[PDB]
Every structure is written in C-alpha cells, then in structure tokens.
Design a binder for these strands. Structure first.
Lengths: 323, 323, 323, 323
DNA sequence: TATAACTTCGTATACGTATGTATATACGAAATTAT
DNA sequence: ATAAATTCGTATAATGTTACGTATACGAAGTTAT
DNA sequence: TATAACTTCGTATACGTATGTATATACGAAATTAT
DNA sequence: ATAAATTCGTATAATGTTACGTATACGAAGTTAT
C-alpha cells in the first residue's frame, strides 16, 4: 500500500482547496509538534504507532494543554491516517483509553473553559467619553469600530471585509450595513445590521476624516500610520489581529496594562462586543431567541454562556424560593 | 463479483416499485450525462472510475451547474454502485475531496441555494379579491386551489392526489382534507388538514361548478377545457405541471410577463404558498412547533430558512442604545 | 450449526417466559401461515429462503393485508432466524426491496389506518337515559362499566382486573379507584382515577344488585347469566372480549346492527370511551398534556389522532386566515 | 486470542483512570460475587460460560436481588469480557433471554424501582425555621447545605466538590456556584448555579463561622468536630456519606428514628432535594424545559417519573361530567 | 476518656448519556514599512 | 335451544426500549481531635 | 380550425427523513355452561 | 528608533454537518375536446 498512501497524499494535496487555508495551518502545526516529539524520542512519525500516540498525548497533558487542544491534536492525526488509508491512532484501545483518562482527570483537576471579557454599554459609554473629543484619526476610527461592533454584534473578520458601498442609509438619520454572515449554500446571502443614531455620527466622523468615501470599493476601516494619516484601500483589509488590538488597547487606556501571569483573558477581544451586547440585551429583558438573531447565533447554549451569571437568568428555583 | 452485479441490478429492477418514479427518472438522467461525458473521453461508463468521476464533477462545475445538482449526479452514481454491490465512487478520496472543494469554491464564489418566490396572505387576499367575482370554472378552480395551497401548505403533488372521499367536515362546518401519504414511515394515519370557513367556501363553490362529487373516488381537482367544462376523473389526476401553471398564471395576471433573464423563481411556483405561509405564521408570533405541524415538518432548518429576513433589524440593539 | 440451531431453539423455549403468552401466540400464528404457504407451494419453511419470503410477502399483499401486518409477519420471521443463529430474511436484498415496494405501493393505493368510533358524553347521556331505569342486572352493570370507562379513560384489561377492594371512597360522595397501569420497573405503582358523583351512583347500584361486596377480593365486574343473576368471582375476571361486547351491544341497542361489509369499525370498541373522553376534554378546551395524563398517554401524536378532526385543533393557518 | 486478552486486561488497568472509581468498585465487587458462586459450584470464573452466567443471574433473582442490580452484575460481566476482547455473555440467547425473563417475572410480581423520599419546599422552610436560630457551626452548615441542595438540585458529590473559588456573586447580590464537571462531554463550561438571597444568606453565615474562605482553594463544605470547630481543607472534602448523613439526621430531628423495617428511603437521602425540587417546580407550573435546566437533565423520563402523582385526579373529567 | 463527627468500605440499587471535525478567534511574537 | 361468555386465530393499532457506565443508599467497622 | 388547457418529457435544483419489536386491542367464530 | 500593522504559530472557543432518496422548476414538444 506504499503506493496507495502515496496516491492518497497526492489526492489530499491535489484537492487541498477542499479545506480552508487556516484549517491546513492547524494540521501543519500538529504534524510539526508531533514529528518533532518523535525525533526527540526516537519514534516513527508516520504512520503513528498506538503506544507512540499514547505517550505523546500523555505528554501534551503534562505540557498543561486543555482537553479540547489534546483532542484536536489527536483528531488531525486521525484524519491524516484515515485519508491516508492507514489505521487511525484513535482506533487502538491504548489511545482510546488514554484520551478518556486525560479528559476525566483534567476535568476533575478543575479545568475551566476560557471566558471572554464583556464590553457593555457602561464600557462603551465610558470610552465614548474619553475618545469622543480627540481629534486624533486613530481615536476617531477606534470609536467607530467600537460602535459597529457593539451595536451590530458582528464578528471581527466580518467588520474587516465591510466596504463603504456595503453601507447604505435609511430608516431616518440612521445608517445601514449588509454583509455576508454565513456561507455553504444554506445561508442568508446577507442581513442588514443598522447602526443607531448615536453610532452613525461616529462612523461618519471617521469616513470624513479617513476619506474612505473616495471609492465605494474601499473598505470602511483601513490603516492609520503614526503620522495620523489613514490609508483607504479596496484591495487590502485590516487584519483581524489589528481589530483585536483595538480592543486590548482601549482596555489598556482605561484599566492599566494587562497582568504578569499569562492567564489568558484579561482585556477585551474580538468578541468582547458580542458577549457584552448580548448581556445588555438580556439585562433589558429580551427573548433569548431575539438575542440569538442579533448576533447570528443559533446555539442557545453559547448565548446562555454569556448571560448565565446575568442575574435574571437566575432560574426557576430562585423565583420559586423568592416568593 | 462479476456476475453477482448483474443479479443485483436485476433484483433492483424487479422490485423497481420500491423507489419513486422520480428517483428512477433522475437515475437514468444522470447516467445519460455521465455516460455521454465518458463517450466524449473514451472511458468506461460502468463501473465508474473515481478519477473519472472527479473529472466529471469538475466538468459539471465548469458547465456552471449548481452545487445541489452536482451532488445529485454524484448521488445517483453512488446508488447505482452500492445497489449493485460495487464500491461507490464517493468511497474515494478523489471524489470525496473534489466534492467538498467544488462546494467551497462555488459557495465562496457567492453561490447560494434559491427558494420559491413567496405567496403570502396579502397575495392570496389580493388574488381572491380579483377572481372571487369570476364565474368561469377555470377561475373558480384556480382560486380554490391557491386557497388550499396557502391554508394547508400542502405540496402540489399531495394537493393533486386529494380525492373527493378524502374531504370531510367538522363541528364548525369547515372542510377537512385527509392526506394519505406520509414520508415519516410507520402508521401516522395522516394529517387531517383543516380549511378556513372562507377557504372552504371557495372549494365548495368549485366542487359545485365542477361536479367532481359525481364520484367520491374522483380527484378533487381536474382539468377544465376551453368551454369551461370540467373533466373529472378517478384515474388520472391534474398534472403537477398544471398546478405550477396556476401559480405562474396567477402571477402573470397581476404582474405581467416575467423578464427574459432566464432566472428561476421569477414568479410563483408550486412551493410559493409553502414558503409564504411559513413566514406569515412566524411574522405573526406562532410558536415554531405549531409551524412544523402546519407544514408537516419534522425538523427546524427549512422552517427557519424560509424566514430569516423579517424581524431582523428594527429596534433591538438600536432602541436600546438610543434611550 | 444444526446442533447450534437445536440448542438455540432449546434456549428460546427454555426461557419462553421471557415473552408474553400473547406475544408467542402471534409468533405461532405467523409460523402457521408461513409453513402452510410453503407446504402449498413446495418451499423449505425453515430456514426461509429470501426469494421464498419475497413470494410470501407478495402473497400477503394480494390477500389484502395492510403494511403493518405484512411487516409483523416479516418481523416474527426475522427474529425467529436471528435468535436461531441463522440469517434473517430481511437481511437479503430481495426481501428488503419487496418490503419497500409493498409499503410504497399500498400507501399510494390509498391505505388508510383504522379509526375507532367515539363514545362521548352525548352517547353516554343518551344511553344513560335508555338503560338507567331498567331493573335488569345486565343493564345495571353495563351502565356502570360504561361509566368507569368514559370517566376514567381506563383500558379494558385494566377495568377487568379491578377488584372491589381496589375501590375506595373519598373526596365527598364520590368514589376512588386505583389500578396498575404500567409495569417494567419504571412506572407508577398505581394511580387513582376518581368517578364523579353521577357515575358512583351507577357503580353502587351495580355492587348492591351484584353483591360483589361479599368479598373485597371479588372483581368489581363479573358474569351475569340469562337468569339475571350475577356471578361474583375473585378468581376469574370478565374477558376483555366480553367488555368489548358491552360496547358493540350498547351501540346495537341504539344504531341498529352493524353493516354487511366487514369494513371493520362500525360499532364501539374497548377504547371507544378513551377516544371519546379525550375529544370531549379537547372540546371543553383542555391542555393536550392534561389529556395525556387522564388516559395514561405519553404519545401526544396518538392523542392528536382522536382530536385532530375536533374543530379546535384546526391549526394556526385557520386562526390566521379567520382574522 | 489467548495472550492478546492478558495485554488487553493490562491496557485497561494501565489507563484505569479512564473509568470512575465507582465503576472499578462495582467491577471487582461483581467479580467477587460471581467468582464466589463459581467456586461453590466448581466452575471457571473467567472466561464466563453463558449457561453458567444464566444460572448465576437466576441465583441472584432467587436471593431476592432487585432487577436493577441483577443487570449490574450482568453489566460488569459484559464489560470485563468486551474490554478483554472476548465475547460478552449477553451475546448469548441464554443470558439475553433469562435477563428479559427475570425482568418480567419480577416486575409482574409487583416489583418496581424506588426513588428517594422527597424533600420539598415545606420541608426546607420547616427545617430552616428550626435551625436558623442555632449558632452551632454544625447547625449552620447543615442548614446551608440543605439550602444549596434544594435550590441547586445538585447531587451530593457535586456539592462536595464545590471550592470557595467557585463561588461568585451577581448584579443582585446572590451567590453563584460554578459546577466544574459535566457528563455531557464536550466543553460546556459548566452550569453557574444561582442561589436565592435567603439561601445565599445561609451559605454566607456558614462561610463566616467556618472560616473556609481562608483559602479560595478550600472546599466550601468541611467537617466540624465536637467542639464546633470547623476543619477546612483544600485537599480532602467532606465525604458524601457525611452529606447523606445530614439528610438522615435532619429527618430524624423532625420525625424521630425510622422503623426497623429495613426498607430503603425511610428518610431523606442524598437525592431527596432533587426529587423534591422537581415536583415543586412541576406542581407550580414551570415549563418542563426549565426543569431540565434546573436539575441539569438532558432528557425527559426522570423528571416526569419524579412527579406523576400530584395533579393526577381532581376535576378533569369529573368536573366535566358533573356540570 | 469515653465520644461526637467522620472516613472507609462493600454490597444493593438508582441515575444517565449517547459526536468528531472543519473553521474562526486568541494572542504573544517575529517581520515589515513608513515616519 | 340459547343467552352470556370464554377461548381461539389473527388482522392491526399503540407502546416501548439497548449499551456502558457512573453515582447514590446505608449498615458496620476503623479514625481522631477533643 | 386554429386553439385553449393540458399532458409528457428531460435536464436543473430544492426539499427531507433518519426504528424494529414486544404487547394489547379487534373481532368474527368455534367451544362451553347453565338456564 | 518606533508607531501601527501584518504575518506566524498554535492554544482553544464556536460552528456545523452525512447518506439516500424524493419532489419541485420550467421551457418545449405532443394531445385533444372543442
């Protein structure tokens, strides 16, 4: 089958476009860490031996990696073999048993997921006070971005692809914006998040000083060098990383600067506006389903993960007990 | 396996009544196109070669075929091979991966599934207000049909199968159409579709002027020739092509001829009342479960898909941000 | 494996108590009809050949047997072989294809399930007028039975096992009765259907004239010969058939006597009081779940099969259309 | 397969952390009883013989063991053989049929599963009204525990795992216990159990007098010696046997010693608050979905089972029959 | 000083879930380009 | 002979669950800071 | 008498379900027992 | 040199679907009682 595996790998690469470029990066990252460990421990890297993958998994656990990550590592290895025509490591009792041991142990050892910091109206209003009067182009853009986000529950990559033309005007002195949001045959070509009155005036103060209006193709948000001059572009969009940074920086301008321990989730992030908006919607009392829509959600659970600790979403028992 | 395949193909044909006429229609159709491509490239048409099927699916993609239809061509190919004892083409990395790729590329290219132009309440009320005055048998039938289609959400093939004996009455006086043919197979007696008093009146008027009640085995709907003379029958039933034609004509009767764009769903089709009734219920509250019941749905995707466009925006976060 | 099948059959008979006696009767009935057909057509009866079972199935269809029955026949045959260590007929493509053909055909040929006649308050009140003054012991018992049934949605076999002691008195001048209803670890030891004021007086007029009170063990309902003398017994209960007959007879005393065509479901039956009571509950507007309980129901569907044509359970579309 | 089994058994023991301590506890327990019976009858204990296992299960039945426990003995036997590569006893008609039989015979004999004596609101309010006045640390802990048990419906093992760091507050001031260990495995962060203001006050008072907050890694609940001195710890946690003891003592403190009937659930056990809270919600409306959420249920059987006894009768058909 | 309050234990029995992968966000960090 | 059922055969409607663990129930013996 | 109103057809594409068995009721009919 | 990003690697949270049919969409040719 040495020729069959050869063909299979030729098949995978031939139709690599069958998977996202980022998806491949993930697989490459695993194969990199796995192969390396093998070289350091003297173990055939491909195909992988059950006992080998068992030792490797037990290794990742020590590295302190969460279960979700260890599973992903195994997963990539599994598919790599399945699509290679070879036996998958997860098909061996050794690996199956070790994965169960790790998941159980780690869970009992107190393994908490990763919560995200919330960016609510109280934070958006405090900021809306600090960087609302600044004449700095950077500040004018950051606020606009912080507006669209919170007000549209939009994802980062989504706000990054937004173009000037993608934004229309209607329903009064307010604004309109329609993006993609979804994509696999079944989806909603597009929706139409509409900025409020007190957000459109922030997005206009940005387009006027940025000049993104000099070409409907130009993305709404662009670059802004140290000189304070924007760089409107209809060919390149702001990296999601950059947008994420706008969150961390804003949070820095207010609550100091992160913390020593790399404990992971100290400042605001790409979805700090989504979690926040949802909670704010739940606070004012809004049907969960209604909150589902606002943020293109379809997994009540996830939405219930941001507003659970929300003191209204307390539960029946509490209402029963409290008369 | 070389003659066992012949027998398998023979057993499938013997009990061919096990599959719908449409399945066979598509089967032989796909085989025609696939065999045609094979001929133009001097290749074996059966059994198919995974590499060859890959070239074929990519050929369909090139022809501009939709993703859902490319999958159909693959689906029939898989069936003919599975129901024949041979390995399915999809059992190959080449085919399996190229199908995922084509799906991506196309989707990312903007492609998306289409749905029948909606036929909501306003439409029904408008068409009714225009044809309820006609005494023509054709007009009396088309109006009762559309009323049944909207009210019952039934598909055109089910509506065309309704026999006089199936119709019944209630304690309130409203008709009750019994649908004898459910696809969630077991023994669900069938749904007893109830009509509104106003809609029952429409059907009642048609039955009269049509005299289909001459035989309780007659099909509720029949053809009406030029001289406005009904042609009831208990054997043959109005072709679904005729029912789709009513939807198309009732649309042209109000909006005129459709552009020569060639596009699909430029007018009402056999599913218009379905997608239209679902939205009307959703937009007017109506719990999702009841909606499922109404349209006879056992899932959730489709019902949602037909809506997602109405009460998207308006108020929500905006109203919250303002005051 | 001739010895393995021998052992297996010895296993099945050894632990025959693993199945209900009636369940076995069913299996015997199938094996009887199957073997007979084989003898008449010259075909090995056990083990069964795919083509053989195919011909047999195709035969039952001609006999005019519904799909549910034909499936049962196959089912018994399947298990017989599975538990015999032999291959099941349903495991062959021939039989699998034929079953699909039959189910599809019959369904398209207009195969309606079997509906039961309803015994509602209007029927119970009309009867309560006819046989309420009669001094005949038979009449006094029949009415009492017709009372418990309608008022308790109880099953027949359940009303048959009822004993005098199983009936207590409380909640005023009313009566109380607790039976089994369920039984497989998870269940409700028992419930407690309570007769109304205008039903308890009917059950007492029976116990006083029957004398079932001369032993708490004695079943509530007993025999009543032509002489008009009851036969209280704590060892033997009234056959379900007898109770069913009380339904048919009552229906006879009023709407003539059945009909020529053995069309199956002309008079009332063992559950004519359940279907009726439910509908009556739905009429007065009662939460489906509430109706579920009353009749130990847990399958909303079934309950929705009795009250569907109930003109209140019309649907959303109707409410929408009717303003 | 003769040494492969040894390795399999070796791999299971190596990664024994893959299974719960209770699974292993039951495993070795069942093996003790099974091996004991084998010894008394001069038979091989492993691998087990289907005929021998049959004699064993029937032996348990004879001993009067419950159906659920007989199934446990079969369950462990099956695991030890499957996880060892050998065929499971249940893969035999003898065992499979005898288990169905025993289930029937026992059930039909009247046997039924039992459930913990309920601990509803009235009970909690009563116990509270009696211990809320005590200053003893033991009394202050037991009252906070019962309050947490009722309010949160949490099991005793989860309640015993709660660490101080897990407790948090809300916008209203009510505590929020984070449960870090869910069995519907993926990454459900966990449930954030919210307490009522009144119940939070109870916990707050205990934390104080216990000084467990001395270490946020300390277990919310610890032991309290004779001198009323708390003994916090971040390593060892209050034994579940101790928590069950609180339920038993709080019951004896109100109803005195339980009869020497030997029966189970003669007093409140670790599941009392669970079954008790479920009914309290059901009896007070509360949609089933919310109930599931409260008790952390993902199904429907158990929740229902805990109720079915309340609003059974009363009114319903009776009220309808009367007037 | 015997003792309250558990902890550990073993057999009996009730309670419960049932997916793995492709894709996007996190985010500290190295690379890049224009002030 | 026949009312009133009971027992039978079998079509057909309504009900109900398997597999593999994991956690609680509880009397009894062993532990420990008082 | 050409023609409204379909029917039949074939390729293109959207819509949809996913269980089988053990047990109880049906019910016409033969068997049974006491008036 | 450095603000402002972009590109990279990879831990980790959130999203989403396969298999096998079955039915509709619609322009075009053939059918038939007027």
């Amino acid at each position: 089958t040495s020729d069959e595996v050869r063909k299979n790998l030729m098949d995978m690469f031939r139709d690599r476009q069958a998977f996202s470029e980022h998806t491949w990066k993930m697989l490459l990252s695993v194969c990199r860490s796995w192969a390396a460990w093998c070289k350091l421990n003297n173990r055939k890297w491909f195909p992988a031996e059950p006992e080998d993958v068992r030792d490797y998994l037990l290794y990742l656990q020590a590295r302190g990696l969460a279960v979700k990550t260890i599973q992903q590592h195994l997963g990539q290895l599994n598919m790599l073999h399945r699509r290679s025509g070879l036996p998958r490591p997860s098909d061996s009792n050794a690996v199956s048993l070790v994965m169960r041991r790790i998941r159980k142990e780690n869970v009992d050892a107190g393994e908490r997921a990763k919560q995200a910091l919330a960016f609510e109206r109280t934070d958006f209003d405090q900021v809306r006070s600090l960087m609302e009067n600044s004449d700095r182009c950077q500040d004018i853009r950051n606020l606009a971005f912080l507006g669209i986000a919170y007000n549209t529950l939009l994802k980062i990559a989504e706000i990054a692809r937004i173009r000037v033309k993608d934004i229309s005007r209607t329903d009064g002195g307010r604004m309109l914006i329609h993006i993609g949001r979804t994509k696999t045959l079944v989806s909603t070509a597009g929706v139409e998040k509409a900025l409020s009155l007190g957000v459109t005036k922030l997005v206009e103060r940005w387009i006027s000083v940025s000049g993104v209006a000099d070409d409907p193709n130009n993305y709404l948000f662009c670059r802004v060098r140290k000189n304070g001059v924007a760089a409107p572009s209809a060919t390149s969009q702001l990296s999601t990383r950059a947008l994420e940074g706008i969150f961390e920086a804003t949070h820095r301008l207010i609550y100091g600067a992160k913390d020593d321990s790399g404990q992971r989730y100290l400042a605001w992030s790409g979805h700090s506006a989504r979690v926040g908006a949802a909670r704010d919607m739940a606070r004012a009392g809004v049907s969960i389903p209604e909150i589902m829509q606002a943020g293109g959600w379809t997994n009540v659970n996830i939405v219930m993960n941001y507003i659970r600790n929300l003191d209204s979403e307390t539960g029946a028992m509490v209402r029963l007990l409290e008369d």
